[PDB]
Amino acid sequence: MLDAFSRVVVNSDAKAAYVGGSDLQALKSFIADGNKRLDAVNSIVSNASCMVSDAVSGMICENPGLISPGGNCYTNRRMAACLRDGEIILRYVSYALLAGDASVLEDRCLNGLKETYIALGVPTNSSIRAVSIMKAQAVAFITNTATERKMSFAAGDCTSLASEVASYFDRVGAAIS
């Protein structure tokens, strides 16, 4: 598990160089934005239970065959596991937003999720369709354009943290494809 600081040391260890100079000036501007990243992880963890129950319900309203007899989200034992399967994905994305590096997402959650879901009979078309709803919710909460709740932040721009959290949620969908 690497964070954003461990990545620039592994890259410098391959050539056996001391960290200094231009990549020390790229690191001082990563911490200048370090409060925006801390402001924005909090704006997702605070809304984490409504983000999941809206994404699972919105996957169901698009494909109501999942709640038919024989559907994958049919019984109460299987409905409670999709609500659990879908908030572990959101939990591991919030680790990657706090760390600033998608290493912990890629190996503790995504490595082998596709082979697991097509061994339990889980439709990977619908799992992509719930992950893409959680992508639209996380970009709305970070840019503070939710229609259901407006948070309080200092004034400024956080469109690079929205580009980063959309890249993590696009990977999740590309991995379980």
């Binding site: 169901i60 309203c61 109501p64 709640i67 038919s68």
Partner: protein, 113 residues
């Protein structure tokens, strides 16, 4: 262990739809009453009929008759059977499709036209 009227319904779906006519939708069976609901939206058989699209321009006037010949009758004279506290009403509104019967019909009465 099939029953004789159980299929006599099912032989009309074996013909093609140009010669089977209305009988080509005979294979759909009775869904449960929540399957016609607004998440699922199972289609009833009568739509596959022309009796759903009976929308004429003409209309009976009902005032040109003699007084006492136009008869009307409500379903129940009760506030609580026409509409409960929930919206599950058999008579008022869009929840009249949520009956446990009335999913299939008798259109093997007529013809293969």
């Amino acid at each position: 262990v099939s029953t004789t009227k159980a299929d006599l319904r099912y032989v009309g779906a074996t013909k093609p739809a140009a010669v089977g006519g209305r009988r080509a939708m005979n294979l759909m069976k009775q869904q449960p009453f929540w399957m016609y609901g607004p998440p699922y939206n199972a289609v009833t058989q009568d739509e596959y009929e022309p009796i759903s699209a009976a929308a004429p321009k003409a209309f009976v006037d009902y005032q040109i008759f003699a007084p006492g010949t136009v008869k009307v009758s409500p379903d129940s004279v009760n506030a609580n059977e026409l509409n409960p506290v929930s919206g599950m009403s058999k008579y008022i509104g869009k929840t009249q499709k949520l009956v446990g019967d009335q999913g299939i019909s008798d259109r093997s009465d007529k013809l293969p036209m």
